[PDB]
């Protein structure tokens with residue numbers, strides 16, 4: 586798993602065309618999204634993560650949380666992102682691991698949002714200036 | 728070299744604190760920037776690129792130019808980014824590569840922009856979201872530098 590964390594003033598998206606023959610189904614409400622004062626997590630689920638979804642998710646959960654806590658972020662946004670790696674996990678596996686991360690962050694008490702999986706999305710983001718507002722991590726099954 | 732291309736409505740940044748001890752010197756104007764209808768190139772210069780700076784730059788200038796054409800981008804922005812790779816090039820090599828790509832892009836006729844190297848920066852961006860507004864590329868040297 587390749588993660589990119591951006592502490593942002595906001596994250597906003599708008600669903601466009603599908604990027605997969607059969608993307609995640611979504612209601613009208615889910616077509617647009619917006620969060621403010623949020624740590625945005627751009628995540629690429631990798632092929633090697635297929636070996637241990639749980640371990641990967643748990644560790645990913647822990648890292649996002651630590652950072653979310655370090656920068657004083659109460660809102661976290663999970664953003665399916667396929668461009669932080671070239672060894673991508675198949676869709677169904679990535680979606681599952683992404684959901685587990687989302688659930689685990691919700692479990693920790695964070696106000697958590699997510700963007701629909703499998704669609705091209707126009708999006709707006711504003712990274713804060715500070716030293717910890719732009720971090721990257723690599724979580725993989727040991 | 729790892730490159731993340733974002734065709735966006737605009738890009739804007741503002742320098743904050745310094746990320747490196749000896750960061751690139753800058754003028755007053757280089758502190759803030761804003762460019763419209765631009766293909767933004769976030770680039771992580773890697774260790775393997777040190778093997779042949781000129782070659783890797785030409786290969787990156789080529790790819791970036793190609794994508795700019797596919798989306799009809801008249802504006803291009805070179806954004807120094809250290810998070811697309813875990814095996815980064817030294818500060819000087821990266822600065823030389825980035826400068827070469829920035830310059831190569833100007834020569835290809837594009838209106839080019841850039842954000843200062845080695846500085847934490849706040850930035851805003853707006854991906855257009857069409858099929859080719861989010862793309863990534865991996866560029867590396869094949870031959871060894873001769874000089």
Ligand SMILES: C[C@@H](O)[C@H](N)C(=O)NS(=O)(=O)OC[C@H]1O[C@@H](n2cnc3c(N)ncnc32)[C@H](O)[C@@H]1O
Pocket residue numbers: 604605628629630631665666667673674675676679701702703704
């Ligand atoms: C390869 C292209 O022709 C194809 N349209 C494509 O984009 N596939 S993809 O791997 O980029 O994935 C498309 C979208 O499905 C979701 N997706 C698929 N695989 C992953 C993954 N491994 N990690 C995160 N998101 C993924 C994301 O929304 C991603 O943007």
Ligand SMILES: C[C@@H](O)[C@H](N)C(=O)NS(=O)(=O)OC[C@H]1O[C@@H](n2cnc3c(N)ncnc32)[C@H](O)[C@@H]1O
Pocket residue numbers: 746747770771772773807808809815816817818821843844845846
């Ligand atoms: C030194 C750390 O505390 C700091 N977080 C850091 O990331 N430094 S760094 O070496 O990754 O690079 C900091 C900044 O210098 C520039 N930079 C340094 N190395 C590279 C590189 N290999 N490719 C692109 N930019 C780089 C970029 O502006 C990058 O954001």
